[PDB]
Symmetry: D2
Subunit: 123 residues, 4 copies
């Protein structure tokens, strides 16, 4: 599959670092370090990927989650990235993400940010 | 924390079933069964939640991922849910989600659907 | 078409008020009053809708924009709602929205909130 | 304001062409031509922008809508772009978008795609 292509260290356009291991069963496990926001050091991440993707040139669907609490900081929030891995000489993981932070019910309408990250193997 | 409140079986407005266990360390593990789409039976899910949320009445941020492959079907896609758990007599998990499916590079602009699910303990 | 069904006053789950006129050519024009956020009184809105929708029971696609500046307040932001109108005894406009606020380049990753509003003719 | 900076022709990363006029009152009017999808030729667009943005280096919030019907084609859908204009030697409009297409109630969960476009004055 793409187990070998996905496993490793990835970097996004903000300078964040995404370290992941893809399991034969579709599991994703690793750590995430964000260059921006209320974050410092590494955070636990877990997710899933399609371990038997199509063979027609389509990308490989995947997703993962980080809750922004570690031994140093708690930002009472979590981000999920949803996207596809695209292999080749210039491999990429193209994603869109949702960041939800805890709010009161009255402020819940404003609880979720949306964005997009592109991860590459270099930089 | 909310370990006890989150762990259990949840149902969304489509009739889907979300079975999860919240760990003391912030882990989420379980299965998901969707009432709609290219899905049948249960799928593995993993995620994270804030295990030390604020005590001011704010919700508890969390997220999880399902890759839509199991022993019966493969839809070459994955969904991530991002949201917050709100406890009380009428406990809820209010979420927004991103569903990415594998595509060629030319069709990648159309690869991601967005929606929102509300999960309750009843129905 | 749905010109007659769309034109009028609509209310969402937050208590906001959406007053719109649908033109024969696909134009939407009106005002929006939000019950939440950095808003007060009415704001100008403009948008578009499908003036020749399918006749198979499908909804009618539409969208509109509000920039949050009026004679009283400026929140340096704009929201776009994208969705479909569903006619009948219990007519609805089901939407998802994106709220972008002006930021510096360093904070741009956090510039956009996402949510969902359901509008009805009553309440 | 940014009336002069916004008005003109813009191009995104797909090769689409966005022609807009910014009014002194905050109005946006023009045409959109998409290089991808069920689209051909030009489509009417309308939107709004912040006509008195902050003067601290922040971007200028804006949004617009296209319903995908013209004299040649109807795709029973509409897209809204939400974002901010960033002036300078390399001016940009950075956006995220929501594309909703008409569906039956049973398929409504799958009615909305999400993406992101960056518009520049060249290419
Ligand atoms: O900033 C974070 C955690 C780090 C997010 C980095 C994102 S993930 C997507 C993108 N990709 C990256 O690599 N990095 C960024 N959470 C915001 C939580 N706060 C809301 C918020 C929203 C916007 C700006 C600041 N805060 C609430 C709060 C609770 C307590 C204290 C302080 N704040
Ligand atoms: O339908 C699925 C998996 C189930 C999703 C259920 C969602 S998750 C969010 C929401 N909440 C729920 O409880 N249920 C729904 N994936 C679509 C993958 N296909 C694209 C697609 C998009 C829209 C409609 C149908 N297909 C691509 C494809 C690859 C091979 C074969 C067939 N199709
Ligand atoms: O609140 C607004 C305008 C009203 C939005 C109501 C939304 S639209 C979608 C939903 N549906 C509704 O009917 N109502 C809500 N804009 C936020 C702009 N600010 C960021 C921001 C983000 C979150 C919370 C507060 N502020 C930036 C800023 C610039 C200057 C001063 C103050 N603030
Ligand atoms: O493709 C369109 C209109 C053009 C969209 C271009 C987007 S806008 C955002 C991005 N930025 C750009 O510059 N271009 C792209 N609408 C899809 C409507 N159809 C669903 C759909 C979804 C995915 C792929 C194809 N179709 C439904 C349908 C109704 C009748 C017939 C055929 N199809
Ligand atoms: Cu914060
Ligand atoms: Cu499918
Ligand atoms: Cu504000
Ligand atoms: Cu189509």
């Amino acid at each position: 599959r793409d187990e070998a292509g996905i496993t490793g260290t990835w970097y996004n356009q903000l300078g964040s670092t995404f370290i992941v291991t893809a399991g034969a069963d579709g599991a994703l496990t690793g750590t995430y370090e964000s260059a921006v926001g209320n974050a410092e050091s590494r955070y636990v991440l877990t997710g899933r990927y399609d371990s038997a993707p199509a063979t027609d040139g389509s990308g490989t669907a995947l997703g993962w989650t980080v809750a922004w609490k570690n031994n140093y900081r708690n930002a009472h929030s979590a981000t999920t990235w949803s996207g596809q891995y695209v292999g080749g000489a210039q491999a990429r993981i193209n994603t869109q993400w949702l960041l939800t932070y805890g709010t009161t019910e009255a402020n819940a309408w404003a609880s979720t940010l949306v964005g997009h990250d592109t991860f590459t193997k270099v930089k």
